[PDB]
């Protein structure tokens, strides 16, 4: 939740409520899907809790979480027209001896529209 219509330059905070698993042992990620169906990685944290973003939103989006209240947040700032899209969050796993790379869904979306 937190989506909606947006004028360019605005700001917005999306949320993501998780249940049954805790954020204390699970990681969550932000991925969007634009109207032309293309999927993009918005932001991620590692197992050590380090954060990364692509250039596209670098400096504008800020991922964060509350291991206590089981919440994942996306704080978009200086919104552009190209941020219009459905936003999902997912937990990452690895079971394989390496990076927890794959974002495993559980979000039903939340459409942000910048116009």
């Amino acid at each position: 939740s937190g989506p909606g219509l947006v004028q360019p330059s605005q700001t917005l905070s999306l949320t993501c409520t998780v249940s049954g698993f805790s954020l204390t042992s699970y990681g969550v990620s932000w991925v969007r899907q634009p109207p032309g169906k293309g999927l993009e990685w918005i932001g991620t944290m590692w197992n050590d809790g380090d954060t990364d973003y692509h250039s596209a939103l670098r400096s504008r989006l800020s991922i964060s979480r509350d291991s206590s209240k089981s919440q994942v947040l996306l704080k978009m700032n200086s919104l552009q027209t190209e941020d219009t899209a459905m936003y999902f969050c997912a937990r990452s796993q690895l079971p394989g001896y390496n990076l927890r790379g794959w974002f495993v869904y559980w979000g039903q979306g939340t459409l942000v529209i910048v116009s």
Binding site: V31, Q33, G38, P95, G96, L99, G101, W102, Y105, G109
Partner: protein
Amino acid sequence: LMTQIPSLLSASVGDRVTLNCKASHNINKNLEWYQQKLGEAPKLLIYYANNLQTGISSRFSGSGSGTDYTLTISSLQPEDVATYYCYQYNSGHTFGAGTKLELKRA
């Protein structure tokens, strides 16, 4: 990053299909495949190269080496239509453009 070919894939029920992805650097075997059935969020099929998730039927299998990975459906069933996406996480967490599978019918 990732390149997915083909873009569209008309296939008949019972047919086999293959979708492949390539990357720009070496990615060991860290690669997933997602199915986004229409009107729903995406779902996981195979992860870390070739490894059926715990509800995916065995008609789906994954493989690949160096930079090219392929998803194979041996007998295409009706429920399998929608857009498939490869996701590559050895280097840095990117999705392929998508391959829409459409059921060829009479």
